[PDB]
Amino acid sequence: VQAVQHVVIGPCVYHGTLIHCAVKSVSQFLTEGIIMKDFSHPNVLSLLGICGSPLVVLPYMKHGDLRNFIRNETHNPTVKDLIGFGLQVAKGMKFLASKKFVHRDLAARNCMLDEKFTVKVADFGLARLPVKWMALESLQTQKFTTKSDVWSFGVLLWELMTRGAPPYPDVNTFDITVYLLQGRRLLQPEYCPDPLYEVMLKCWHPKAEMRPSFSELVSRISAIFSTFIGEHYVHVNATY
Ligand SMILES: O=C(NCCN1CCOCC1)Nc1nc2ccc(Sc3nnc4ccc(-c5ccc(F)cc5)nn34)cc2s1
């Protein structure tokens, strides 16, 4: 009854103020907002408040989604930059995992970049089959876990290192499961350091309990990230 008051605010998505905002178009809605509001992490997209239209108000993200940022030819990411985006995502997913939150649709298109170029994992909560991002077991059961978020994460790093290339462009979505089960993974991007590809393959472990945790991923990617100085510019493949 009064439990939603901290979430509520008075005076398709629209621009807004109060902070620059995205403002999107009953009992479930009140409860969900309260769950969503109690998530707070620098790498997870905030719920600012809810309003009656009804309205969901989120922070406006200056640079938009992460797949479009990296695809833009007038941006010049270095390997360091891109591993840095991956490290941020991993930190957001670590938080969501600690909250027992299974994202289910982790992808570069669903992460956003604010004005400080902080990546926020998004498209979850009220702010919400992606077969080419899905774990083998989830393609088989339509059941998702944190370890199946880990798989998606490994696809997301792939997207990172290719500057937003579509995964398995030659495989039709209806076919991905058969393709994978022949014994295949995504190939190593031209600008993907060997140590980061090893991580990708770990994230794609055939056994779900064997994939690293997001805590493990943060630690590991934080180390590899620190080895770079932003001297290597990542260019775009001609085949993708
Ligand atoms: O669009 C910009 N910035 C403009 C960036 N441009 C690019 C062109 O070059 C000029 C600079 N900021 C925004 N912030 C927000 C904040 C919240 C929301 S609702 C929401 N909730 N969860 C999600 C998750 C993903 C998406 C999404 C996906 C693809 C997209 F394409 C745009 C948005 N939305 N979403 C929309 C926006 S859009």
Q: The domain that contains 93 carries what CATH number?
A: 1.10.510.10
**Helix/strand/coil for 226:** helix
Q: Which residues of 21-40 are buried (b: 16+ CB within 10 A; e: fewer)?
A: bbbbeeeeeeebbbebbebe
Going by alpha carbons, the residue nearest to atom 27 of ligand 1 is: 65
Q: Is the CB of 149 under 6 A from ligand 1?
A: no
**Whether residue 154 is found in the same domain as residue 190:** yes
- Domain co-membership, 56 together with 167: no
89 annotated ligand-binding residue: no
Give the strand pairing for 20-24 and 56-59. antiparallel
Judge whether 12 is annotated as a binding position. Answer: yes
Strands annotated E in the chain: 13-17, 20-24, 49-50, 56-59, 111-113, 119-121
Centre a 10 Å sphere on the Cβ of residue 137 and count the other Cβ atoms it contains. Answer: 16
Alpha carbons within 13 angstroms on the beta-carbon side of residue 58 total 28
d(CA 74, CA 200): 27
Contact 118, 51 (CB under 8 A): no
Is the domain of 227 the same as that of 173? yes
137 and 204 fall within a common domain: yes
Task: Name the active-site residue from 65, 105, 175, 194.
Answer: 105
- Of 21, 25, 45, 112, the residue with max ligand 1 atoms within 8 A of its CB, to mutate for a pocket test, comes to 112
Domain region containing 233: 61-240
Task: Assess whether 123 and 138 both reside in one domain.
Answer: yes
Query: Measuring from atom 17 of ligand 1, which residue has the nearest CA?
Result: 22
- What is the Cβ-side half-sphere exposure of residue 67, based on CA atoms within 13 angstroms? 16
Q: Is 24 annotated as a binding residue?
A: yes
Identify which of 127, 110, 12 has the alpha carbon closest to the alpha carbon of residue 64: 110
197 and 94, same domain (yes or no): yes
Looking at the fold, whether 96 and 168 belong to one and the same domain comes out as yes
Give one DSSP letter per residue of 130-180, joined into a string: -GGGS-HHHHHHS---HHHHHHHHHHHHHHHHTTSPPSSTTS-GGGHHHHH
Measured between alpha carbons, how far is 159 from 153 in angstroms, rounded to an integer?
10
Look at residues 189, 180, 175 and name the one whose alpha carbon lies nearest to residue 151.
180
The angstrom resolution of this structure is: 2.0
CB 189 within 8 A of CB 162: yes
Q: Is 105 a catalytic residue?
A: yes
